[PDB]
Amino acid sequence: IIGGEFTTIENQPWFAAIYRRHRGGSVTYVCGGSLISPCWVISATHCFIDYPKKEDYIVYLGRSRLNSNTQGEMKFEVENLILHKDYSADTLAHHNDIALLKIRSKEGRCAQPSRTIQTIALPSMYNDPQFGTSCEITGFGKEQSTDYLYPEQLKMTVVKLISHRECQQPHYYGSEVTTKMLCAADPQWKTDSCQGDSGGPLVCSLQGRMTLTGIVSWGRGCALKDKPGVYTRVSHFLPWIRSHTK
Amino acid sequence: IIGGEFTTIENQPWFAAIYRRHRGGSVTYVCGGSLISPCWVISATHCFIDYPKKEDYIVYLGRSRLNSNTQGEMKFEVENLILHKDYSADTLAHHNDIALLKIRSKEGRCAQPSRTIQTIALPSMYNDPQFGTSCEITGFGKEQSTDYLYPEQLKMTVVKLISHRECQQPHYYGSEVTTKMLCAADPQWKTDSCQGDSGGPLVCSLQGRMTLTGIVSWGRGCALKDKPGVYTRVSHFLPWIRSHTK
Amino acid sequence: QVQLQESGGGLVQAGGSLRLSCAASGFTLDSYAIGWFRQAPGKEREGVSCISASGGSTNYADSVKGRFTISRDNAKNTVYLQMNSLKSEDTAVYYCAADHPGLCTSESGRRRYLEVWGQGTQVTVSS
Amino acid sequence: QVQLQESGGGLVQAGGSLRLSCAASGFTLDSYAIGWFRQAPGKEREGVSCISASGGSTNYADSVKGRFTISRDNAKNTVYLQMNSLKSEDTAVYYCAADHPGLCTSESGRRRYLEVWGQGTQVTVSSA
Ligand SMILES: CCCCCCCCCCCC(=O)OCC[C@H](C)[C@@H]1OC[C@H](C)[C@@H]1C
Ligand SMILES: CCCCCCCCCCCC(=O)OCC[C@H](C)[C@@H]1OC[C@H](C)[C@@H]1C
Ligand SMILES: CCCCCCCCCCCC(=O)OCC[C@H](C)[C@@H]1OC[C@H](C)[C@@H]1C
C-alpha cells in the first residue's frame, strides 16, 4: 500500500494473509485475500496460477503483522484451491483474476468470528457503488514501487472508484480495462495498492454494509499518474463464486 | 567483506569507521581507514574526492558495529582531510588511491591506545610480503555484490597476495594494475572486499609485525573469478605519508 | 533516511516539452552523480541521462541525445530532466537514481554507494 | 532464506562454448520465471535470456539468439545458460534473477514477487 496508514486487523477483520511454504522451511508471503464465509477465502488467480498446489499454502486470519503473531489469529491449511478457468494475462490486463481457498485448521475447524476475524459481504448481482465513491484497500504490499522491503504492519488507504469511460482513455489503460474490472485511484495519485497487495479487498459501503466490491489485481507501476489500480469486479462473478463454494 | 567471519574491534584495533553527515539529514557510512599514529588515519582518496569537505566527516575508533555504540569507542572530527593530488580514475583503475585524515575529539584530543584502539605499523620502503602469502582485510562492506543491506557487525577475512605478472594478464586486469598497486584474492574466488570496504586495511605480517601493506581500493565486481581485489601499495607512498603528516 | 521522489509526469502532445523533477530528502544531491532511467511497456529498463558528482559533465543515451537535458539545482536539492521535442517512443515510467557504480561514476571503486532509487513518474506522449 | 548462486564462468577462446549454472537455495526455481542478464565494462546491463514459470516459453535478446540456450533442471534445482559461438562482445559479468515483474512474466500483477538476484559470474572471451 502506497501512502495511507498503518492499521490493525480489527479494522479489516476479513483480511487474510497468504503465504507459501518451500521445501527446507523458508516461507514467503504471496498475497492477500478476504474471508467471505467461515470456510472460504476469496483472492486472485494470478497469486497461484504458477504453482496451483494447495498443500504448500498457509492462510492466516486475525493477523496484523507480516513476521510475528497477533493475539487471536488463526492459521489454516488450504483444503481446496480453486482458480478461474478463463484467467489470462497475455497483455497488460489480468482477466478473470479471482480465486477461492477453502480453509481448514489443524484441528479441522473453519474461521471462528471475533473482533479480529469476520466475513465481508458480497455484493448483489451487478450492484456496484457509483463512480467517485471512496473505498478502502488493505495489505502487506510495498510502500513504494521500488522498495526491496515490505511493511511489517498491515496498512490501509482510501481510493476512489473511477468510471470505465475515464479508465479506458488511451493514456489510462485503453481497451485493457473491461466491464469485469473496476478502476480505483487517488484524485492526486498519492495512494494506491502495489506489489504484494493482490488478492486483498477493495471494500465499499453499499449501502450501510461494508461490501467486497473488488479484489486487488493489477496496474501499471504503483500510484502513477493516470494509471489507476485495477480490481476484479466481484459483482460480475457471483454465479462462479456460488457454484464453486457449494 | 564477501565470506570470512564476524569479528570484534579487539582483533582489528587500528580499524577506523568513517561516516558522512548530511546537513539537514542523515549520517551515512562512507569507508574504512587505519590508525597509523594517534592523530592520523589513513584511507582512500576516492572515498572523499567528490566531497572533500573535512567538516562533514566523522571518524570512529574502537567501533565494531555500524549503527550502535561499542564500549570504549572514541568519536572524532576531521581537522585536516588530505587527498592525493595525482588521484585519477579515468579508466577502471584508481591511481594514487590514498588519503589522510587528521583526527581531533570534541575535547581536543588524539586517539588514546587501549585494547580496542591501536596504531598499525607502516611497512619499510618498498618492502612487501611475498606473493602467495596470507593477509587480512576488514570492513563494514557488502556481504554479497548485489546486496542492498550492509552487515551490522564488523567482518574480516583472509586473502592471498597475487603477483603483478598474474594480475596483469589480459583476462585479469591487463595494464590497469600498476606497480603502485597490489592484487589479493582467494584462491577459490570465495572471499574478497566489496563496496563499503574501501579505505580499510590489508594487513600482513612483515618483519615480525602486523603491517599496513595495502588499502582497499577497487576491483571488477566482488569475489569474481580472475578479478582480484586491488589495493593501494602503501610501501610505495612513504614519502607522501611522511611529508603530509608533518 | 535517504530518498528520492519524482514528479512532473503526465500526458503531453508529440513535439511538446516536459520537465521532470527528482527531489532528494535525507541527503543533498550536490556531491553525487545522479541519473534518469526509463522503462516502456514490454521493454527493458534503459538509461536516459546522467550528471556527474561535480556537475561538470552530463551524458545522454542515443535515443534522447540532442533533445533531453539533465540539470541540478543545489538550492532546491532537486535534479531535472528537460525533455524537448517529445516523441511517442518516449512514453514510459521515468525513474531517478543517485550514487550507483557506473552511473556517471566509477564502476570499480569499493567505497559505499547510496544506490538510491525514486518511485517512478509516468510520461505519456500522444502523437 | 531465498538465494541464487551463479557458477561456470571463466576464460574461453572465441568460437568456443561455456555453460553457466544458476543454483537456487531456500526455494525451487521450477515454478518461477528465471532470467539471465549481463553487464560488460562501461556498458548498461542487458537482458540475455529468460524462461517462463511453466517452462512453456523462452525468450532471447537479439544479440544472443541462435547462440545461447536457457534451460531448467528441476532434479538439480538449477537453471543453465548454454553459450555457443562465443565472441569478444559476450565478455561480461553474468547474473541470474528469479521472479521479477516483466521478466518472462507479467509486469502489471500486484502479487508479491521474490525479486531475487545472484552475485555474478565473470565470462571472458579471448582470441587465439
Ligand atoms: C525493468 C525495471 C524497471 C524498474 C526499475 C526500478 C529500479 C529498481 C532496481 C532494483 C534492482 C536492480 O537494479 O538490480 C540489483 C542487482 C544488479 C543486477 C547488480 O547490482 C550491481 C551490478 C553492477 C549489477 C547491475
Ligand atoms: C536498489 C539498489 C540496487 C540497484 C542496482 C543497480 C542497477 C543498475 C544501475 C545502472 C547504473 C549504470 O550502469 O548506468 C547506466 C546509464 C548510462 C551508463 C548513462 O546514462 C545514459 C548515457 C548512455 C550514460 C553513459
Ligand atoms: C528488489 C528490487 C527489484 C525491483 C525490480 C527491478 C528489477 C530489475 C530487473 C528487470 C527485469 C526485467 O524487466 O526484464 C527484462 C526482460 C529481458 C530483456 C528478457 O531477456 C531477454 C529477452 C529479450 C527478454 C524480454
XYZ file of N, CA and C and ligand atoms in Angstrom, chain A residues 148, chain B residues 148, chain C residues 44, chain D residues 37 45 47-50 59-61 100-103 115 117, ligand 3:
79
model
N 12.685 -2.710 -1.774
C 13.012 -4.146 -1.708
C 12.366 -4.772 -0.465
N 21.564 -5.153 -1.022
C 21.202 -3.780 -0.732
C 21.572 -3.387 0.703
N 12.836 -3.506 -21.741
C 13.681 -3.409 -20.583
C 14.015 -1.973 -20.226
N 20.973 -11.921 -17.080
C 21.394 -10.600 -17.509
C 22.926 -10.575 -17.625
N 23.586 -2.700 -18.177
C 23.065 -4.063 -18.006
C 22.089 -4.384 -19.138
N 19.423 -7.562 -20.568
C 18.781 -8.865 -20.544
C 19.328 -9.772 -21.658
N 19.558 -11.027 -21.324
C 20.126 -12.006 -22.249
C 19.078 -13.070 -22.632
N 18.426 -13.643 -21.628
C 17.504 -14.732 -21.849
C 16.587 -14.902 -20.658
N 15.403 -15.461 -20.897
C 14.563 -15.877 -19.800
C 13.692 -17.056 -20.152
N 12.722 -16.730 -24.084
C 12.988 -15.507 -24.862
C 14.483 -15.178 -24.860
N 14.960 -14.565 -25.945
C 16.384 -14.288 -26.152
C 16.545 -12.895 -26.698
N 17.590 -12.208 -26.243
C 17.943 -10.938 -26.815
C 18.469 -11.155 -28.221
N 10.928 -11.622 -11.215
C 10.826 -10.143 -11.307
C 9.710 -9.764 -12.271
N 8.900 -8.735 -11.942
C 7.895 -8.273 -12.894
C 8.504 -7.950 -14.240
N 7.889 -8.468 -15.285
C 8.362 -8.244 -16.643
C 9.360 -9.238 -17.180
N 9.963 -10.066 -16.329
C 10.987 -10.973 -16.748
C 10.343 -12.332 -17.034
N 11.891 -11.349 -6.548
C 12.863 -10.374 -6.990
C 14.265 -10.727 -6.490
N 18.210 -11.850 -6.891
C 19.386 -11.782 -7.770
C 20.519 -12.676 -7.262
C 14.152 -5.974 -5.148
C 14.151 -4.756 -6.051
C 13.857 -5.127 -7.508
C 12.899 -4.148 -8.182
C 12.550 -4.593 -9.608
C 13.620 -4.238 -10.642
C 14.259 -5.485 -11.253
C 15.266 -5.177 -12.360
C 15.295 -6.323 -13.373
C 14.326 -6.067 -14.526
C 13.577 -7.298 -15.013
C 13.041 -7.071 -16.416
O 12.336 -6.108 -16.644
O 13.320 -7.989 -17.513
C 13.703 -7.544 -18.818
C 13.358 -8.611 -19.860
C 14.588 -9.128 -20.628
C 15.114 -8.077 -21.612
C 14.381 -10.521 -21.264
O 15.675 -11.057 -21.567
C 15.866 -11.237 -22.974
C 14.517 -11.105 -23.663
C 14.569 -10.195 -24.893
C 13.531 -10.717 -22.551
C 12.496 -9.642 -22.938
